[PDB]
Each structure stands twice: as C-alpha cells, then as structure tokens.
Amino acid sequence: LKKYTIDLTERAEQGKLDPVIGRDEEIRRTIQVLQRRTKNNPVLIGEPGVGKTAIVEGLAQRIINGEVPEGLKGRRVLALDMGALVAGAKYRGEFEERLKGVLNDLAKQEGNVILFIDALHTMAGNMLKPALARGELHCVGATTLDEYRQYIEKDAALERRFQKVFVAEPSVEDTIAILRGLKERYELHHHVQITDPAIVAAATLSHRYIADRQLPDKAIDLIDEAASSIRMQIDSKPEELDRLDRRIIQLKLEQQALMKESDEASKKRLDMLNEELSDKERQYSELEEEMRLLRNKVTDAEIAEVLARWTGIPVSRMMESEREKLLRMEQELHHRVIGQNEAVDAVSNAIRRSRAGLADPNRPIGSFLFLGPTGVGKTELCKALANFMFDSDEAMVRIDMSEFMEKHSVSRLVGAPPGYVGYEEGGYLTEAVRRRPYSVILLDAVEKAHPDVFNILLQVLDDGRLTDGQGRTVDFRNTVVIMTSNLGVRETERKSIGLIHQDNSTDAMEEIKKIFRPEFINRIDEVVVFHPLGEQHIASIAQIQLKRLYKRLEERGYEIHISDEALKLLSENGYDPVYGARPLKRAIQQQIENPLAQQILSGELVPGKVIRLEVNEDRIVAVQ
Amino acid sequence: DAVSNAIRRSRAGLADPNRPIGSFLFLGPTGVGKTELCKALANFMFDSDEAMVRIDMSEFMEKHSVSRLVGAPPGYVGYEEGGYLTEAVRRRPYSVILLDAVEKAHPDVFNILLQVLDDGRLTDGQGRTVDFRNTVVIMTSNLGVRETERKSIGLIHQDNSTDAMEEIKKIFRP
Amino acid sequence: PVYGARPLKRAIQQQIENPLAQQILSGELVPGKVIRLEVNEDRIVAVQ
Amino acid sequence: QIDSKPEELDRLDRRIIQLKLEQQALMKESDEASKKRLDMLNEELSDKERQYSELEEE
Amino acid sequence: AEQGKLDPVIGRDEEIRRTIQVLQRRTKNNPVLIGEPGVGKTAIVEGLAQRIINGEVPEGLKGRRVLALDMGALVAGAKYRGEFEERLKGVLNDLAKQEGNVILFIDALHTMAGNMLKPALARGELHCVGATTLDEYRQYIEKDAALERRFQKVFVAEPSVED
Ligand SMILES: Nc1ncnc2c1ncn2[C@@H]1O[C@H](COP(=O)(O)OP(=O)(O)OP(O)(O)=S)[C@@H](O)[C@H]1O
Ligand SMILES: Nc1ncnc2c1ncn2[C@@H]1O[C@H](COP(=O)(O)OP(=O)(O)OP(O)(O)=S)[C@@H](O)[C@H]1O
Ligand SMILES: Nc1ncnc2c1ncn2[C@@H]1O[C@H](COP(=O)(O)OP(=O)(O)OP(O)(O)=S)[C@@H](O)[C@H]1O
C-alpha cells in the first residue's frame, strides 16, 4: 500500500485533481455502492469522457472535501494504478507471493484502506475472490464500456464482485456551470482571464454541432484548444506585425523558389513582389516602431474560425470582403455559364439561402432535385460549382446509381452487413462521400435505385445524416447536395411537342408520389427546368470555349487572333432545330483544327511568331 | 388522445407481462407530424431528444440483414460488433424505439417481431434469450401514403382497411 | 389538398426570406432593434 | 437514513448545493446586460432556502 | 539538426503553424500529420525541429529537444516476460527524468502497450508527437474518446503546380 498505490485523496489534498463542481448524483451512487456489502465494487460506466477515473478521484475529492456522510471517514482511498506491479520479476512464482503480501495487507486493514484499479481491465482474479470473500479487498472499477464488458461481464462470480453505475442527462445549463466552474482553474492553468462568450459558445454550440463526444467535456477540450491558440497569440508579437512578418517568411520561400533559374533577369516577372518586399519592410517597420492588438474576446467567432476550418460553413470568410462576389454571383457564373435566368437566380439564390443557412441545422443546406431537358451541360455546371466554391473540381464525387436493380441494392450502396468483404469495403456513396461528408454529394440517375434509396434520400433530406449496415450516423448536416439525376430526360425530351408542362409534372409527380412522400416535392430547393439557347449564347460559349484555349496555348507561348468572318461561319454552323448547342465543339474541331494541325506539323506555321486564322477558303484555314 | 391514453395505460399498469407495452399501426395521408410527435414523446417522460434515434426497415432487406438485427453469425465481423436490435434493446430495455416502414422488412423481421409479440423471447445469431416483455415500440408506415392520397376522393375507411389487409395478408400472419 | 400545410416551411423561407436575407446581409438593416412587420407593397416585405 | 441527514433533507440540501455551487460557477460573466438574467434561478433559490429551512425545522 | 544533416523544406508555413498550433496542447496534445507515403510529413516534423532549433520560432519552442522511442530495440530482446517491460518502464521513467523536456516524435503512432501512456498524457505528465498515413489515420482510431483525448491532427490536401 506504500509501494504500489497512488493516494487520490492526497492528489485532492494538494489540488492536482481539478475540482469538480456539480453532479452529486453519481458520486452519491459510488458511496451507495460503498456501503453495500455484496456488489461492493462500483463500476463507473459512461462513454469515455463521462469521467470514470475522474469520478473515483472525485470521490476522493468528496472524501477530503467532506461532502460524504459518516461511515467512510477513516476508510482510506489508495489506488493501485497500472505500471506499479510490473517490477523486475524475471522469473515465476514471485507474482503470487507479492500479491499474497498485499492481500495480507488489505486483509489486515479490515475496512481501513480501500483499493482501486485504474482502468479496471488491467488486473489476477485467482486471489482477489478470497479477499472479496472474507471482506478484506475493497477495490473499485473505473473503465470504459468495452473495457468493462471485455474486462468481464459474463462471470456470475465476478459480476457478483462488480456492480455497474448508470447516469442521467440534464440540459446544457449544467454544462455552462462546468465551464464557468472551471474557467479560472484554466486561467491559472492557461495564462488568461476567461471571459464568458468562449465557454457559453462552447457549451451551446457543443450541444448543437459536435457528434463525437458528450457534454460538457467536448466544450472543455474545446476551451483547451482555444486557450492553446490564445497563448500562441499571447507570447508572439502583435497582430498585423505578424501578418507582415509571417507573410515575409512564406513569400520569401516563394521567391526562394522564384530565383534559382536558368536566366534570372528575364523570368524576374515577379519584380512587383520585391518592391512589395521592401514595402513589407516599410509597413512592417511602421508597425514595429508602432487593444485591437489584443483579444480577451477569445472569440466565439474565432474558435468558430477553428471549427470553421473543420466543418464546411466558414466564418473566417465573414470578416473578409465577400459581398462584391455575392452581388454578381450571377455574373461570375456568366463568366462560364451564361443565360438561363430563372436557373441562375433560382439556383444561385438557392445557394444564397443555402450557405446563408435559412433552414434547420437538422435539415440539409442546398437540396436539389433537377428535372429537365438535355443539351445543357450539367456536369460542367457541377464543375462550375466545385470550381466556383471548391475552386477546382475535387468535390465532384461522381457515383452512378444505375447499377442497382436486384434485391440487394442498399447492401450495395448503403454498405454490406458485416462479416464479409463488402462491409469493410462499405457502400458506394457511403464510402466515397464518407471521405468528404461536407462536400458535393453528386448523383446521376438516382431513379433506378431502390425505394430504400429513395427513403434514405428522405433521411438525408429530412434528418440530414446517413446510416450504413452497421448502424452509425455519417453526418450530412453541413453539406450541399447536387442531384443531376436522369429522371427528366425521356419525359422532358419527349414532351415536346404534344405534352404540356402540368402533364409532365403529373406523371413525374406520379413517379415521385409513386414512391416519395410530399416532402420530396416540397423540401427541395427548386424544381429547376432548363430551356434551349439563343444565338448570342452560342457566341458567348464560343468566347469562353476560346479562353481555355488561350491559357492552354499560352503555356506554349503562342498568340492567335480571330476575325469576325470565322465567327459568322461558326454562328452559321451553330444551331440545329433538333439538338441545340452540343455539336459546336465537333464542328470547330472538324473545320478548324484539321488544317491547324496539318500546318503546325507540316512546317507552314513558324514558332515564335503570332498566328492569325484567316479564310483563304470557303472554310477556316491557317496562315502566317 | 390515442397516444396520450396509451401513456396513461403505460404508467397505469393494465398490460399482460408476455406482451409489449405499446404497438400501433398508422395509416393515411402524409403531412400530419408523426415523428415530430415522436420527438414530443422523447420530450415528455425521459425528457430528451438525445434519446431519440429513428430507425428504418428499408436498408435491411438482404440475406444477412436478419444478421443485422440479430448480429452476425459466429466467425464474422459484426458478430463481435453484434446487431442493432440486440445491442440497442440490451443497453436500456425501458426506452422508446422509433421504427419506420416495416413493410420494407422481411417475414423474418416479422417473426422476430412475432417473438416481440408472442412468448417474449428472441434468440440471436448466438441464440441466447432477449428481454422484450416490457418494451415500447413505434412503427410508422408507407401503406397509408401509397394507397390513401389518391383514394382520398370517394373511398371509405373499411375498404381502406381491406386493401391494406390484402397485401398485409400475402406476407404477414394473423 | 394532398400536400396540406407541409410546403409552408419553404413558402416562408423561400417566399419571403430570400430578399429578407439579401436586405439583412446587404447592410441596409442595422441589427439591434425591435422588428415591426411593416407594409410596403403587395408582396410581403420586412423593413427596419 | 437514520444515521445521516434525512432523505428529503438531503434532496433539499443537494438541490441547494446544485444551485449554490452552480453560482460559484455563475459569478464571473462576460457583459452585464446579457448574462445577469438569472433572476429566475434566484427566486428558485429562495424556494430552495425556504423549503430546506422548513424541513430543516420539521 | 545542429549539425544540419536533415532535409530542408520549401514554403510550408501555414499548415506547419497548424502543426505547432496542434503541438502546444495538454491532452489531445500531440499532432498527427495525415497523408500517404509520397508527400513528405517527416520533413514537416523535422522542419518543425528546424524552426524550434534554428530560431524563427517565438518564445516557448526555444530549448525543446525531440527524442524517438523505436520498436526495434523493443522487440530486439524480448526473451523473458519483463525485459521488454523493464525497458519500456525505463522509457517512461526517462521521460520522467527529462520531465517533459523530451519531445517524443512517435512515427507509426499505433505501435506504442498504452494504458501506462494514457494517464500521463491525461494529467499533462506526457506529451508526444504522432504520425500515420491518410488511410491509416482512418485506421488509427478516432471514436475511442480517450484516444480522442490523447491526440489531434494536421490537415493537408492534394498537391498543386507552384509547390
Ligand atoms: N467538472 C470537471 N472538473 C474538473 N475536471 C474535469 C471535469 N469534467 C471533466 N474534467 C476533466 O476530464 C478529464 C478526464 O477524466 P478522467 O479522470 O480521465 O476520467 P476517465 O473518463 O475515466 O478517463 P479514462 O480512465 O482514461 S477512460 C480530466 O483530465 C479532467 O481534467
Ligand atoms: N458549358 C460547357 N463548357 C465546357 N465544356 C462543356 C460544356 N457543356 C458541355 N461540355 C462538354 O461536353 C461534355 C458534356 O457535358 P456535361 O456537363 O457532362 O453534360 P451532362 O448532361 O452532365 O452529360 P452527362 O453528365 O453524361 S448526363 C462535358 O463533359 C464537356 O466535355
Ligand atoms: N406537421 C408537421 N409538424 C412538424 N414537423 C413536421 C410536420 N410534417 C413534417 N415535419 C418535419 O418533417 C419530418 C418528416 O415528416 P413527418 O411528419 O415525421 O412524416 P414522416 O412519415 O415521419 O417522414 P419521415 O420522418 O421521413 S419517415 C419531421 O421529422 C419534421 O421535422
């Protein structure tokens, strides 16, 4: 008891055990087990982070703090932790000897020293049952759910040794009382003065967002991380000084990339960045020679910037300048997708209300069932939205739902039942959107998937979470979906002419209301129906079809200027009454790119010189 | 009044001990607020929507989904991880369970469900007994929406009951 | 008749709350005061 | 229950220990005009002290 | 690193501020670099060592020095029941002798026993550095809320042209 044990009451005497304000219920549950003769060893069972070790050591905090009544005063808490019994016994038999020594010690305590097994799955059993049979061992269990059950559940002799402990959960109120009850201990443990908004945002926002740990402790280590980044601010220089100096370090690593060259002077095209280097010396000198350089407002906005680096709705963007690209979000789509006014306003306004957040957080954000014709370019619009917000097309997780015809379809895409290859491989959308849950959940042709797939669209559209075969919640409460499904193609291509719009809504709503409930008609953002294009739109997609060719042949170092007559021939070959604007790239390549390749390989086009496409033909030809 | 009188019967004590406490079949058009009322049922007596999980019978249609509700056969992943029904009831047997669209489930969940109803004992992949004899279940349906919203004009309630009980009759027992 | 008062969630958030979000985040509406649902013209507009 | 303080007595004493150590949390705040709302927990604490004094006497 | 035998880095300041900013905690205290074996995360912990030792770092990481428990001498002679145990308790007590002025960059973080590592990481008595592959940080474990209270990660994405 003097060699192997750690005195938890002494830990609560000096105060290395962080004081626990509240929860008298389960410490009273411990004391109620301690008066109990049989089933005398309590087992603290919660999730990890219900504080099982901290409830035994806080039971020592009660035994020193006198909140315990008569009966246990004198019965001493001494904790056999792991690591203690692992002494230099290189040979056998001495283990049973030293255990016989310490069980003669608690055998002569006679209810004066209480034993404790920290992380109960450690310790034995061949010797504690006599010491739990006379009345001489008084041990305590504190370990997790899996480590108590797999410690032992099913021995009816050892569950005769161990009683479990179960809890009750009130509101976020007493979590706020944990955070204010601990915030000055982490002032003198975290070098600050904890104002309230960081911890009340930690409590309420922890009860809203975090689906991995539990109240209040997820808020507690959020304040740990918070005061960590705060002391990162405390011991460094003031703010904009570190803006200047840190961008000096990283950007001089960029010029460190941008100096070791073949010819240094000609590719010093970054000369503005070096005048800006001496300018960073200039304003960085203004602010080194020269609060709002301080934050006791920790802040909710700034650990909302940390959590905003986590989730997928930012607030670090919120203190930036964003309204100028918001007010021409239509026109910044018109740089690559022109026309379709109720589509760019219904879709773009649906993006505004979506990432603005006007619905339930326990509802999805941008929820779209697309229904309409072809000849439009849906995946290039999905690339316009990943290349719009995601700034390039990583989010385009394209998972075709066409494969799913037989009985076992939700074992296919949801994930297989365990005990097989398919569960560890998981489902299709379940896994490839399990990697990025807060992203574009892009789907083509969902209608051929199961009714069960339809009602788990009713799960990610009502609830906004997903469940595989095992039974956990993949969180979708912070993602925008795009469903470029192939529901519309035959109905909306076949509807012209002879079928009015209410009839396509009638039989398409006979498919939806054939399987879905009214919330699939209702709870999407918009039913976005497209229309065919005009001639100036053909001119615009010619221009932006050329801008990619400008940057592409720009990487080689050539120049091409095109007259208006070739524009007139492409406008002539642009539109057909049956198909629309799709074969334009094929006509451009078949009439333009054949003599261009023929003369760039033939030798008639000279490198290092400007190229111009003229017409010494009845079609487009190349010349120098 | 139906669910509230079911609560007064629940805390009152009328029930047969070889039965579940509450079991109902809801039919009709959709738009009434079923699982919002189940969120109020998670709000009233044990006081928390944290204790509302909402369970579905749709994804569980396969050859091994019987071993999803009972746990896998031995020698499998999900045998040591168990099943959703056996672990879920085995943690706290006195709780509120929210099922959806049981027609999606097989006649093997209807016979495990019969063991919820009759004689009160479920044997899993392993085979040990499962305590179901004081458990409250809630099961919603799509039989109401898929033949009521179009037949709301003209049809009567008895014929609604019969043309539910036909496809029920093909795949359930009385 | 089939649908009921179910779409009224998005009749509110869609039908009024899109220009309301435009006017709140536009900077016209300074926060901090008691809101009275005023009447501009025949489509519902909230004014601060 | 006979050796120590009675059941309704330590229900009450432990409700007032919930509210009192809840105030030991609830002292240091951020701004006054928002988070000194807790008037209602104070009059509930008056029910706590009065009922605990009543069954303290009885 | 004083002798300068290690590999340099180019750029790498924002997400290594994510590495230092995930270093200086108490429990969750240890960073994890995420990514496959063709990205270079050991250059990020050793460029971390070059910021700590060379001196662009502010106050706090001036004197900190990094050690490395490896599995090789752990499994070298495990002849009897206790050799590996006397040697690992020697590791933990030598962690106690430099008193937390030992940084322990454990690469292959799941390799390092553990119930003797958990409470010292919990009190503040232990503080290390972790590293595991993208798929293998999906394999490490995140739902053990205890081992959620022992470690934390650093985010790195798909590489670009300019870098
Ligand atoms: N009210 C509180 N007062 C003080 N510290 C608290 C409080 N709530 C949580 N903690 C912290 O909770 C942390 C975890 O407690 P533990 O003693 O590890 O209990 P535990 O859940 O059994 O951990 P194990 O045994 O490793 S599973 C400690 O580091 C405490 O700082
Ligand atoms: N606006 C556009 N800009 C650039 N390329 C386009 C455009 N529209 C179509 N394309 C090209 O033509 C192809 C067809 O466009 P998509 O965006 O895939 O149309 P789609 O309806 O999504 O076809 P799916 O996905 O096979 S049903 C694209 O992959 C591009 O190569
Ligand atoms: N009348 C209503 N009152 C309140 N909330 C409603 C109502 N109707 C729908 N909801 C919301 O929409 C969700 C689904 O609608 P429900 O009324 O529960 O019908 P349902 O049959 O449960 O559909 P589910 O939940 O997808 S199986 C609920 O969880 C609520 O969030």
Ligand SMILES: Nc1ncnc2c1ncn2[C@@H]1O[C@H](COP(=O)(O)OP(=O)(O)OP(O)(O)=S)[C@@H](O)[C@H]1O
């Ligand atoms: N950041 C870097 N800076 C400098 N050289 C690097 C860098 N990353 C990789 N290298 C080079 O690549 C070689 C090995 O790359 P590693 O850094 O070991 O890749 P890795 O991601 O660490 O994968 P491991 O270590 O095999 S798991 C080194 O010998 C260097 O030549």
